[PDB]
Amino acid sequence: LKKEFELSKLQQRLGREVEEKIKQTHRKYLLQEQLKIIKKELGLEKDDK
Amino acid sequence: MVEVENVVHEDFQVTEEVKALTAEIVKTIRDIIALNPLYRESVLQMMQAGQRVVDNPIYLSDMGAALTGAESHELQDVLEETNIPKRLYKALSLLKKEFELSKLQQRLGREVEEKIKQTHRKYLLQEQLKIIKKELGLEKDDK
Amino acid sequence: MQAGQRVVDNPIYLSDMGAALTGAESHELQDVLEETNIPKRLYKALSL
Amino acid sequence: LKKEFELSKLQQRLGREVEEKIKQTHRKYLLQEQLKIIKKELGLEKDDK
Amino acid sequence: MVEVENVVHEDFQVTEEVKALTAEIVKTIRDIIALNPLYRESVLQM
Amino acid sequence: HLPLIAITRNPVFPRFIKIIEVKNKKLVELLRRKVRLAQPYVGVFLKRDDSNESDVVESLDEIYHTGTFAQIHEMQDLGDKLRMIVMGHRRVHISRQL
């Protein structure tokens, strides 16, 4: 149980560290994703101002 | 006033496969009371064709044809018919004739309501778009 | 209960359950019961 | 998978948020509507036009 | 045009902790189809 | 050596589960006399043309020669006082049912 849990623990920590290093991708990228979601959600042609 | 019980009711001696049309009449009645509930459906469970308690089939066919909403004249017309399959044919015809209208009304109701849902749901999407554009698309504050 | 499972260890019982769907009067079934041979009842059933 | 998963989970949270805003709208309308009916029930009150 | 099935697939002999990642791959697939349902879930049980 | 059962417009195709609910209350006496026996059972026959309750008990040639013995499952008696379950399990052609 100790060794198997230590394997799960080292993997969970390694995955948390890789996941944190992937979260390092800036928030501009996230807002850009939502921006593309806005561009492909409805007709782009606003033609207001 | 003079009257006489001239209730003709000829039926074939072999009574095994003759009740199968009755089975279709009760299946149409089950579909009419399930898709167009008029009365409770417990009465259909009380008087079944599998209980062998139908001592008077003519009465059972009339009670089943009574759920139809066809005008009274049609009932008189069914009584004018003398043969047994003709009245069964007419009772089924009355049932289907009502059934088409019922199905039209039901389809129309669900369709029209879904149109209302597609109306307001697209408005919810437009509201989310505005709110997210009126909030996330700012630098410090609008005012 | 399918025929592709090969779990119909007693076919006569399955054939009787399938022959019950026929609307022939009970007497006719008794007539089918008089038959001893299997193809005679199968042919009569197909005719039915 | 995680990169897609983050956006998906974000969209799910965003959707529930707009829906909860609709609920916060209408639930308070149920309370205020009850308030109105009780305020209308107190005889002849509330200066009219 | 000349071609060859150069489907590289190297794997370590010790295959004990290498399937531990598989558990996370299927857990991520279950979370992708559970929190953001795209396809039916009967294929995952088959 | 039991009286014939009153099918009363209920066909029991071989290997086809069926329920029998006779209106008469005399067959329940036979149902209560079989409860102390170790193994519970019932036999099944079919009636001939022109059903008649007086003929089921008067003569025994009316019934056809084929018969189908089977085992009882369980009594219920929800509405009537005679709600037996029947089955077509073992077909038989008795040499002489009388």
From Swiss-Prot, chain B:
It is found in: Mitochondrion matrix. Duodenum, heart, lung and liver, but not thymus. It comes from the Eukaryota. Transmembrane segments: none annotated. Signal peptide: none annotated. ATP-dependent serine protease that mediates the selective degradation of misfolded, unassembled or oxidatively damaged polypeptides as well as certain short-lived regulatory proteins in the mitochondrial matrix. Endogenous substrates include mitochondrial steroidogenic acute regulatory (StAR) protein, DELE1, helicase Twinkle (TWNK) and the large ribosomal subunit protein MRPL32/bL32m. MRPL32/bL32m is protected from degradation by LONP1 when it is bound to a nucleic acid (RNA), but TWNK is not. May also have a chaperone function in the assembly of inner membrane protein complexes. It is linked to CODAS syndrome: A rare syndrome characterized by the combination of cerebral, ocular, dental, auricular, and skeletal features. These include developmental delay, craniofacial anomalies, cataracts, ptosis, median nasal groove, delayed tooth eruption, hearing loss, short stature, delayed epiphyseal ossification, metaphyseal hip dysplasia, and vertebral coronal clefts. Homohexamer. Organized in a ring with a central cavity. The ATP-binding and proteolytic domains (AP-domain) form a hexameric chamber, while the N-terminal domain is arranged as a trimer of dimers. DNA and RNA binding is stimulated by substrate and inhibited by ATP binding. Interacts with TWNK and mitochondrial DNA polymerase subunit POLG. Belongs to the peptidase S16 family. The Lon N-terminal domains are crucial for the overall structure of the protein, maintaining it in a conformation allowing its proper functioning. This is Lon protease homolog, mitochondrial. The lineage of its organism: Eukaryota, Metazoa, Chordata, Craniata, Vertebrata. The gene is LONP1. The chain holds residues 272 to 414 of 959 of the full protein.
Curated annotation (Swiss-Prot), chain C:
It is found in: Mitochondrion matrix. Duodenum, heart, lung and liver, but not thymus. Belongs to the peptidase S16 family. Homohexamer. Organized in a ring with a central cavity. The ATP-binding and proteolytic domains (AP-domain) form a hexameric chamber, while the N-terminal domain is arranged as a trimer of dimers. DNA and RNA binding is stimulated by substrate and inhibited by ATP binding. Interacts with TWNK and mitochondrial DNA polymerase subunit POLG. The Lon N-terminal domains are crucial for the overall structure of the protein, maintaining it in a conformation allowing its proper functioning. The AP-domain (ATP-binding and proteolytic domains) has a closed-ring conformation in the presence of AMP-PNP and its N-terminal entry gate appears closed. Upon ADP binding, it switches to a lock-washer conformation and its N-terminal gate opens. It is linked to CODAS syndrome: A rare syndrome characterized by the combination of cerebral, ocular, dental, auricular, and skeletal features. These include developmental delay, craniofacial anomalies, cataracts, ptosis, median nasal groove, delayed tooth eruption, hearing loss, short stature, delayed epiphyseal ossification, metaphyseal hip dysplasia, and vertebral coronal clefts. ATP-dependent serine protease that mediates the selective degradation of misfolded, unassembled or oxidatively damaged polypeptides as well as certain short-lived regulatory proteins in the mitochondrial matrix. Endogenous substrates include mitochondrial steroidogenic acute regulatory (StAR) protein, DELE1, helicase Twinkle (TWNK) and the large ribosomal subunit protein MRPL32/bL32m. MRPL32/bL32m is protected from degradation by LONP1 when it is bound to a nucleic acid (RNA), but TWNK is not. May also have a chaperone function in the assembly of inner membrane protein complexes. This is Lon protease homolog, mitochondrial. It comes from Homo sapiens. The chain holds residues 318 to 365 of 959 of the full protein.
